[PDB]
Amino acid sequence: TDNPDGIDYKTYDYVGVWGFSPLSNTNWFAAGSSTPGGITDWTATMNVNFDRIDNPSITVQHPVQVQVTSYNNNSYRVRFNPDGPIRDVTRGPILKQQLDWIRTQELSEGCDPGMTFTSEGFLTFETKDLSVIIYGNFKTRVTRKSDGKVIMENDEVGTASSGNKCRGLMFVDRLYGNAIASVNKNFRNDAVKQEGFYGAGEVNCKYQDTYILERTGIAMTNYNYDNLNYNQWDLRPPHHDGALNPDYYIPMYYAAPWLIVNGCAGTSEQYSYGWFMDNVSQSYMNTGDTTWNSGQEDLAYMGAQYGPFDQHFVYGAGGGMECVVTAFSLLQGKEFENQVLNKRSVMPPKYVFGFFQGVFGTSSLLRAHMPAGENNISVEEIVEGYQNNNFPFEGLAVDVDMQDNLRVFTTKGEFWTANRVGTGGDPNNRSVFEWAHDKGLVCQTNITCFLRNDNEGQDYEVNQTLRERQLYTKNDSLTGTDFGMTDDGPSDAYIGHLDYGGGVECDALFPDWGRPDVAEWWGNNYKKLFSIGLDFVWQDMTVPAMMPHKIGDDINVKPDGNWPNADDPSNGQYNWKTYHPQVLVTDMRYENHGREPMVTQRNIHAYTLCESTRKEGIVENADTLTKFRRSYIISRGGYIGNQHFGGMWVGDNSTTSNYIQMMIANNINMNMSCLPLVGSDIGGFTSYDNENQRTPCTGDLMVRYVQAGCLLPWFRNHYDRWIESKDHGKDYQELYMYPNEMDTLRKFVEFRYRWQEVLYTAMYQNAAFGKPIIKAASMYNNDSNVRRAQNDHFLLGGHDGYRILCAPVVWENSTERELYLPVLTQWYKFGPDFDTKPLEGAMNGGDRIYNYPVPQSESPIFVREGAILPTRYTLNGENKSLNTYTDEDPLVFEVFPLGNNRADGMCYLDDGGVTTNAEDNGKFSVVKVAAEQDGGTETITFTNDCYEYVFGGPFYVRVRGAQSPSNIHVSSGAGSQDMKVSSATSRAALFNDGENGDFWVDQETDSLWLKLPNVVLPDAVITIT
Ligand SMILES: C[C@H]1O[C@H](O[C@H]2[C@H](O)[C@@H](O)[C@@H](O[C@H]3[C@H](O)[C@@H](O)[C@H](O)O[C@@H]3CO)O[C@@H]2CO)[C@H](O)[C@@H](O)[C@@H]1N[C@H]1C=C(CO)[C@@H](O)[C@H](O)[C@H]1O
């Protein structure tokens, strides 16, 4: 039952953006005419005639569905299959039942889009603030009720005499290909509109010498790659000479055919809409890039190498780009599952927000058992470096080093306290993870879906059980292609190779995910790791990232590095560093459907791998997790929607100023693509010095790299380590190996740690409401100067999520930067210095300052007026892992200067992930807090949205700029108590000795500290007179 729809597959190789050419018109079909086709529900059908743009006498008929997806969040949808029936996928970001729920709810509220056909046969409908008309040839116009503004319209190519053809719908004559595509007008050169496109996951784009955030006038592609340095040689343009820098026509780790359009920016008449082409074969986004005549300046499109054609336009409930993001997240929501917490994504354990050292080149757990080898390091030495130097440190990212000769899901003797593999729980032979637990730390470890094959007779249960149940991808192809074979077999299995450099490699098999019983099988395997202490997951080589290889060559032999190329094209022989594209894999998009070649769903493999570690690994086997029941995944690849499995790190960056910039833009863009909890390796993964690869990150680059990411969602220093056993990489990169910079380094980690609940809460605001943790400058509304500052200015935190503004310096050996404060509000210089000192005067928003000074010891980070921030200090004053925090380590609602005599704050509370009762049973709290000045009385009010988690220790209000009071009244469900002056004279003595109901006047920081009991948290009126 392979290929049920009779597809003839014309394309298998990687087609660069330069080989994708729908504005070509030749051999392309576009809508020319239609007759109406009925409406049930909110799906209308138009029976559309597609004409060959280059010979319109040739026509075919296919039906197109036009579905309103959310009246309230102004989103609809267009799809059609030109290769067969129209078909609801069963795995993906947008599922039927989440659409069906949204619609049902909205119907109960009595929303009517009034999907109707005029007499002429045109389709008209309405969403909340938008109206839409679609003409005969599919010419689509999207107007905005309030000001009549056309905010979006598709494009039309005229012909010699056959009328006009809407390129809003295009597929290639199935005689010549399978590509699809869709075209809009693009007002990026409109004097008043100045359209600007955004999003597109991990794409990178250079301008002059600087990496930027905007994705306008450029030709991108989604094509998940093993793209080490974001600039892999094989991904270069035809006939490209010299080095290849990362750039926009190079695909990355994550598949996001998604674009957020923002025109008439920062003014009354502004509009934003998102654009998801839901497809998982190689996709394209072209924002009007003339390079290679691939696009035209005044048009934009999306497209794919294969079908079917499914596409979403999401305008959002209201003003600003952010709302596009949140509505998009709704469409992928889990409201239909009655998720009480995880609606828009799954919440990680608190601990996932702390600092992690990853090392590629440890070679034992402890020093006592470390084999002799030049520059070898043990885990024990790392933990020692950090712990001894009072670094706030969370734990390790153990690599394949630990595995037994690269056998995913196992460990070798060296990574245990007693030099042998235990079944664990033996206190005289703890595994890495268990020892790690006793040090306070937690770990992820690396898991690929690569199952060793060259085992040398040696027994490896995970590969053996894959062969038995035939759960491996088979070597069949509709082309008779020979992918190679070894002596280990089996005879009918796809056998790829895994190369990590310097002879660290092996043959491998792989999970044919499509198959049923495969996700169960995958999942139960993580038990071999959970029962030994593994906290969370490090999902890698997810592409699958296999070794380059030419059909015909041996399995362990890759091609010449310069192959393939324009003069010597692949011609169906290159594997593009993964399965040779022809391999028949079982469908991952439609279940019980048959087998397709991988070329048709390449961009789904990692999503699907991630889905399975989630549902079948972490969730089903939570019983076997040890110290924490909740868990997470940090993944390298995936596709839109992946946020419901965990988050992302941007694979293999490097150690240069450019990569810092890139990491930030990437972060910001990944947020607006519904992946909030991502980040890039701090300090860079790969070597960088061309004379001597072993040279490690400079101190100053290390400071800027940490300063820039110390408030990004995922914070992890990871790197390729040179050791005798692996002759590529750098000497060291751990924070503690920098004596000169240690103090700056560490204080910026402590600082993140004090703002831990800020991250936690923002994350909650993402699960609950879908808000991006990190916020493009252009998300701040009514500001005509945020856009120019958008490459390196970003915001996060607070009740609304726009309370902290970061503008990290992005160049090595640099002590200034151009700073823009966003307008119509006040800002305050903050940082690790400002905890133990008074704030400086206000900074008037709307300012541009050239050469704003930033000594190495400082990053530009500001807190807005009106912010109240949940902060967290240790009781004993030391630095300790988040996961060892308990409710005795104070929680501090820091009120800042007031904004129009107002201030507000939100704080999510829950057990941390010790258990899954927050996501499972609604066991959490959401504390709100307000503050108002009224002549002489300031009223700080605590209310709750629910208080299901009982924060067990006293918490504090910290007022900034208000000193010694005449009285403080505290009102509570169990309060009617006046406050008395504490007898402690230091913050430390207030926390540890301080009496409940004690206020302390802090001269040093110009603050007033209120110590209150744990029971008044959910509800109180603090009046300060
Ligand atoms: C560890 C790493 O292994 C593989 O990376 C390869 C590159 O694919 C290959 O191009 C070559 O890279 C050199 C490149 O050719 C040259 O132009 C450049 O200047 O120098 C590069 C090396 O610095 O060799 C490297 C190996 O050294 C994989 O393709 C990568 O995915 C892989 N990174 C993975 C693997 C691990 C180990 O489990 C993780 O530590 C890491 O997080 C993950 O991203």
mmCIF file of C-alpha atoms in Angstrom, residues 517-527 530 611-625 629-631 916 920:
data_model
loop_
_atom_site.group_PDB
_atom_site.id
_atom_site.type_symbol
_atom_site.label_atom_id
_atom_site.label_comp_id
_atom_site.label_asym_id
_atom_site.label_seq_id
_atom_site.Cartn_x
_atom_site.Cartn_y
_atom_site.Cartn_z
ATOM 1 C CA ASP A 517 4.002 0.382 18.074
ATOM 2 C CA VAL A 518 7.106 2.454 17.262
ATOM 3 C CA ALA A 519 6.388 5.371 19.620
ATOM 4 C CA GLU A 520 5.594 2.969 22.447
ATOM 5 C CA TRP A 521 8.860 1.142 21.688
ATOM 6 C CA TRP A 522 10.823 4.382 21.557
ATOM 7 C CA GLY A 523 9.352 5.584 24.790
ATOM 8 C CA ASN A 524 9.933 2.544 26.973
ATOM 9 C CA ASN A 525 13.619 2.865 26.187
ATOM 10 C CA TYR A 526 14.031 6.033 28.212
ATOM 11 C CA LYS A 527 13.354 3.867 31.269
ATOM 12 C CA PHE A 530 15.180 7.365 34.114
ATOM 13 C CA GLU A 611 6.437 13.962 20.120
ATOM 14 C CA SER A 612 7.397 10.411 20.981
ATOM 15 C CA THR A 613 9.945 11.165 23.668
ATOM 16 C CA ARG A 614 7.223 13.382 25.110
ATOM 17 C CA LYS A 615 4.087 11.247 25.115
ATOM 18 C CA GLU A 616 5.741 7.857 25.412
ATOM 19 C CA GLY A 617 8.967 8.673 27.181
ATOM 20 C CA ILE A 618 8.514 11.368 29.813
ATOM 21 C CA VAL A 619 4.713 11.291 30.335
ATOM 22 C CA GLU A 620 3.967 7.532 30.219
ATOM 23 C CA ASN A 621 7.046 6.632 32.234
ATOM 24 C CA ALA A 622 6.931 9.511 34.698
ATOM 25 C CA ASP A 623 6.642 6.836 37.403
ATOM 26 C CA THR A 624 10.266 5.960 36.737
ATOM 27 C CA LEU A 625 11.662 9.470 36.913
ATOM 28 C CA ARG A 629 8.361 13.820 38.003
ATOM 29 C CA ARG A 630 7.948 16.676 35.497
ATOM 30 C CA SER A 631 10.510 16.855 32.750
ATOM 31 C CA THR A 916 3.252 16.876 37.615
ATOM 32 C CA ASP A 920 -2.326 17.313 35.750
#
